[PDB]
């Protein structure tokens, strides 16, 4: 997928996670987010097409998904255990990471 | 290790995983695959020696191991739990990822 | 944080882990190490300021944290399970990875 299909996959599944009722549904939505975040790590954001492919800011932009992918990983494991409320809370606190990168390059 | 020693480590341990009987053996072979996949992520594939070190295709080639390393991670956790059959099935479905990258740069 | 604040976070938490008594304390210190190791992956080490931003040695330097981040991950999961002694032993065997990179670029 391209960058914004991924971004609309991170967002849709955030709402799904906040509204889910069993482990399976949270586990399902986080698994999608992780694939999306990894695929996103390829792309070149609009704001940085006018700069060099290995701009430091292009490296800052890839590092931001590592933070994100590692927090989906913790969230996912809570879900695999069945601590649904804890998994829901972890997913909710991802918006810090989404919106840190957002104000830089969005 | 170099690129093809790693590739022959991914392959040998695939057969090992498909033929194992306890959690320990699957866990052992997947742990080897993860080290191999990470070490592989360094290398420069033959097909891309004649292109620039930061070719997009050299970045596509490193991204492919992330997909791979993250699916070994799930497989490994099933094994740590003891769901041997589920871990065996996850390892089997890695060949999609092996052969996606393969037709591009192998 | 900058590179050496991260390095002094990896070190402080190593001692903390070796001296902890419950799962929670090990889990706490490893979680800090993982954030530190990821943040460190950005930086450019002193020894390699006088070389190109995408030196192979600058790529070797980022690969070293993957090895490190993936071994904190295993350690952390032992701690989440409550195998404190096993988690303590995993953290102790990280110094191989710390000191492999150290003799290259420290
Ligand atoms: C950088 C490391 C980012 C992280 C982490 C997240 N997002 Fe993101 N986002 C980023 C960029 C550069 C852009 C602009 C891309 C563009 O096409 O203009 C975006 C955009 C979005 C969007 C809008 C999609 C669209 O149709 O325009 C959404 C809905 C979005 N981002 C959501 C989102 C969520 C929920 C995140 C955390 C889970 C998240 N993003 C992380 C860069 C980055
Ligand atoms: C790219 C991201 C790859 C992934 C993921 C996997 N492989 Fe791979 N493989 C890749 C390249 C560029 C090459 C050519 C390297 C060369 O030395 O010519 C290969 C090669 C192999 C081989 C052959 C080893 C040899 O002696 O020539 C094998 C056995 C192999 N690959 C196996 C394999 C398996 C089982 C994978 C999934 C677990 C896998 N590879 C992933 C690139 C990539
Ligand atoms: C490279 C991939 C490294 C890994 C993995 C670890 N360290 Fe490291 N370390 C690295 C460099 C290039 C440097 C020099 C940076 C500098 O500021 O000079 C260091 C330095 C340290 C330090 C000293 C901090 C200071 O105030 O100078 C410490 C205490 C340290 N490193 C500890 C440490 C530990 C405990 C590690 C494993 C858990 C570890 N490092 C990994 C590069 C790399
Ligand atoms: Ca949209
Ligand atoms: Ca609900
Ligand atoms: Ca509901
Ligand atoms: Ca061979
Ligand atoms: Ca068998
Ligand atoms: Ca057998
Ligand atoms: Ca110091
Ligand atoms: Ca003690
Ligand atoms: Ca004590
Ligand atoms: Cu895990």
């Amino acid at each position: 997928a391209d960058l914004e299909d991924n971004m609309e996959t991170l967002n849709d599944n955030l709402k799904v996670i906040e509204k889910a009722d069993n482990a399976a549904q949270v586990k399902d939505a986080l698994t999608k987010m992780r694939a999306a975040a990894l695929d996103a790590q390829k792309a070149t954001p609009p704001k940085l097409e006018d700069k060099s492919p290995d701009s430091p800011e292009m490296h800052d932009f890839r590092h931001g998904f590592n933070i994100l992918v590692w927090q989906i990983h913790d969230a996912l494991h809570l879900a695999n255990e069945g601590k649904v409320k804890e998994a829901q809370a972890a997913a909710e606190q991802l918006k810090t990471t989404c919106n840190a990168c957002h104000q830089k390059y969005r």
Side-chain angles (χ1 to χ4, degrees), chain A residues 40-96:
Chain A
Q41 211 171 15
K42 310 173 323 201
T44 37
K47 292 200 156 9
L48 314 183
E49 327 268 73
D50 63 4
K51 281 175 290 227
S52 147
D54 260 33
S55 206
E57 309 99 316
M58 191 60 46
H59 275 204
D60 203 59
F61 164 95
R62 266 168 256 173
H63 169 275
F65 294 102
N66 288 334
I67 310 304
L68 186 60
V69 157
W70 273 109
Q71 268 181 305
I72 294 155
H73 154 280
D74 302 355
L76 194 34
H77 274 325
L78 300 173
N80 275 334
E81 269 160 22
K83 307 149 175 178
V84 167
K85 237 108 245 107
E86 240 201 302
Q88 277 172 317
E92 168 52 39
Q93 65 208 42
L94 292 184
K95 205 66 199 211
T96 68

